[PDB]
RNA sequence: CCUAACACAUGCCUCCUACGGGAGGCAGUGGGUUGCACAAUGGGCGCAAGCCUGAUGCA
RNA sequence: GUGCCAGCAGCCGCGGUAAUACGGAGGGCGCGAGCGUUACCCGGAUUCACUGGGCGUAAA
RNA sequence: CACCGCCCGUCACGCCAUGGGAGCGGGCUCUACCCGAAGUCGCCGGGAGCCUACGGGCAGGCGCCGAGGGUAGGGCCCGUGACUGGGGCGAAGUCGUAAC
RNA sequence: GGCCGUAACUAUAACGGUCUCGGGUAAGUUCCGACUGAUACCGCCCAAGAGUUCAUAUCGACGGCGGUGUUUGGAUGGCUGUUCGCCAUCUGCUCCUAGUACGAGAGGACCGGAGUGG
């Protein structure tokens, strides 16, 4: 654009668009499960990912992924969503914190336990 | 007081006009003023409240132009038309307070909540 | 307390009524540490002494 | 041990009977009254390029 | 898995998803007219009151402004929504065979 | 213009072949947006069955006999022209008896009386 044009119209600042309406731009948001179904992967993957519809305290009701070997998530089980997409499950923008609320941590975890809310295995 | 007839709320949660659609007391009660029970129907209401719009309930009659007299014969006529809805089948006057004056006959035994409010008569 | 400028017992709409009529910061409670002190600095008042001071100095 | 299951997963991916990628164990690496996670900001990003970018066929 | 290949559209089913929108309700930003508290202020304050050193003061009265309320219309975007549209992918749905 | 087969749960079938829902309403069929007695009705007769058991508390198969004159015949409102229908919404209530009799509780009389209503 000409300098004169810039002066007239000028540049337009870019607007970032949140990819996690965990509303109130919170770091985490807790809600309640509606359904603990299972979903099939996308384009080139196969498996039965464990998922859950969640009624947020933020008013929203979204689909969150359940990380880990095996959960203990039911219905009216209170849980904490944390935001994190999952390339294979579209419509799934958050992971479910394991080790918080009704989401029991992964049993028999010995590695990245922190990312699975499982205490330090008392080694004898 | 005969069907139709616009009656105002004198208590709360469902403002203004309220439609009387019946008169109990039995077969052919034409009217019912003073302080009788009357099947009502909310038609306006404030956006808020726990009683929306068009909720077929019953209610009482507080201030009615037809007047009320007794004794001596003197009369207290209030030019208005007071309802004051009551939570329907577990009968009782729903609400918190009552507005304006009330009637001394309204103090009828079994009622009583309503008259310890609306500081008047 | 980054949320609820949400509602607040006690000490520093809700409640009472004789239905006529009335009353409504510090620490803590519910909902989504109720600590010590005038010693010091500063302030109010005082002729000063000193009194007040959940500022504040401390724990 | 399990056998495209159960599961891992930040990205690429790993698991369909020899899996250093799942689960445990032995051993090891790193930190240590901490360690790990999530969230957000800057970085990496000369990927808004003033420093310091470009437009024949890649976006232009 | 290479012409016994590939492949398109209608309609139908599957995992999934969703827009437009008349009105109805509510909010923001208001217009017009009617009612209008407290209070300051303005005028009266009189053989209508109280006080007076007769100068005046107070009570009281009226009035403007005025929080707010009322009837009609408009704005906000949030809600619901009979009405209507309907898209991405799909191994062995249906009718054809458009394309390569 | 017809008839037939057909894709991922069905349903539909692009393909192949072949000759009621929403709105307004408390409620909206409107509105707006998508002589005779066959027959009938009413009664009775028999009693296989059902009713845990037990035909007849209640009902009653297979069949049977009649009576009537009546069908087919020879309380305010919403909707509608409706009748009808669907939908909204003299005697009551209360108290005493007595929260007693009865009842596991839940609940709740008789008889008799008293007041106030449509």
- Provide the CATH number for the domain around residue B46: 2.40.150.20
**Cβ atoms of A66 and A43 closer than 8 Å:** no
CATH of the domain at A84: 2.40.50.140
Its domain, for residue A108, covers 1-124
Q: Give the residue from B95, B5, B28, B19 showing the smallest Cα distance to B57.
A: B19
- Nearest nt to the CA of B107 via C1' is C19
A74: its two tokens: 């039911």
Q: Are strands B85-86 and B56-59 parallel, antiparallel or unpaired?
A: antiparallel
Q: Residue B12 is part of which domain span? A: 1-121
CA angle (B96, B99, B105) in 5-degree steps: 95
Helix (DSSP H) and strand (DSSP E) numbers for chain A: 1, 6
Separation CA A97–CA A82 (nearest Å): 6
Nucleotide nearest to B95 (CA to C1'): C13
B50 in contact with nucleic chain C (CB within 7 A)? no
Nucleotide closest to residue A14 (CA–C1'): D48
Q: How far is CA B31 from CA B34, B55, B79, in A?
A: 10, 22, 17
N- to C-terminal Cα separation, chain A? 72
C-alpha distances (whole Å) from B8 to each of A37, A57, B52, B54 are 52, 38, 15, 14
Distance CA B47, CA B117 (A): 24
Tell me if B98 sits within 8 A of B84, measured CB to CB.
Answer: yes
Q: What is the 3-state secondary structure (H, E, C) of B63-111?
A: CECCCEECCCCCEECCCCEECCEEECCCCECCCCCCCCCCCCCCCCCCC
Q: How far is the CA of B88 from the C1' of E75 (A)?
A: 40
Q: Please state, in angstroms and rounded to a whole number, the distance separating the CA atoms of residues A79 and A74.
A: 10
The CA angle B53-B56-B58, to the nearest 5 degrees, is: 120
Number of domains chain B contains: 1
Question: CB < 7 Å to strand E — which of 53-112 in chain A?
Answer: 63, 90-91
Between the two ends of chain B, the Cα-to-Cα distance in Å is 22
Q: Residue A3 carries which DSSP code?
A: H
From the Cβ of A80, is strand D under 7 Å away? Answer: no
The tally of domains found in chain A comes to 1
Structural tokens at position B54: 């068009």
| Solving technique | cryo-EM
Distance A32 CA to D7 C1' (A): 24
């Amino acid at each position: 654009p000409t300098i004169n044009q810039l002066v007239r119209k000028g540049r337009e600042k870019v607007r970032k668009k949140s990819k996690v309406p965990a509303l109130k731009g919170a770091p985490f948001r807790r809600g309640v499960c509606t359904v603990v179904r299972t979903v099939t992967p996308k384009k080139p993957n196969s498996a039965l990912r464990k998922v859950a519809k969640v009624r947020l305290t933020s008013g929203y009701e979204v689909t969150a992924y359940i990380p880990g070997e095996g959960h203990n998530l039911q219905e009216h089980s209170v849980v904490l969503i944390r935001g994190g997409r999952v390339k294979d499950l579209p419509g799934v923008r958050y992971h479910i914190v394991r080790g918080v609320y009704d989401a029991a941590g992964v049993k028999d975890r010995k590695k990245s336990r922190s990312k699975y809310g499982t205490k330090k295995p008392k080694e004898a | 007081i005969q069907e139709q007839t616009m009656l105002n709320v004198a208590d709360n949660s469902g403002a203004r006009r309220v439609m009387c659609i019946k008169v109990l007391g039995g077969s052919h009660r034409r009217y019912a003023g003073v302080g009788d029970i009357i099947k009502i129907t909310i038609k306006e209401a404030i956006p808020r409240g726990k009683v929306k719009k068009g909720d077929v309930l019953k209610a009482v009659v507080v201030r009615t132009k037809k007047g009320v007299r007794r004794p001596d014969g003197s009369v207290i006529r209030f030019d208005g038309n007071a309802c004051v809805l009551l939570n329907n089948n577990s009968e009782q006057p729903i609400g918190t307070r009552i507005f304006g004056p009330v009637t001394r006959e309204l103090r009828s035994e079994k009622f009583m909540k309503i008259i310890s409010l609306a500081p008047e008569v």
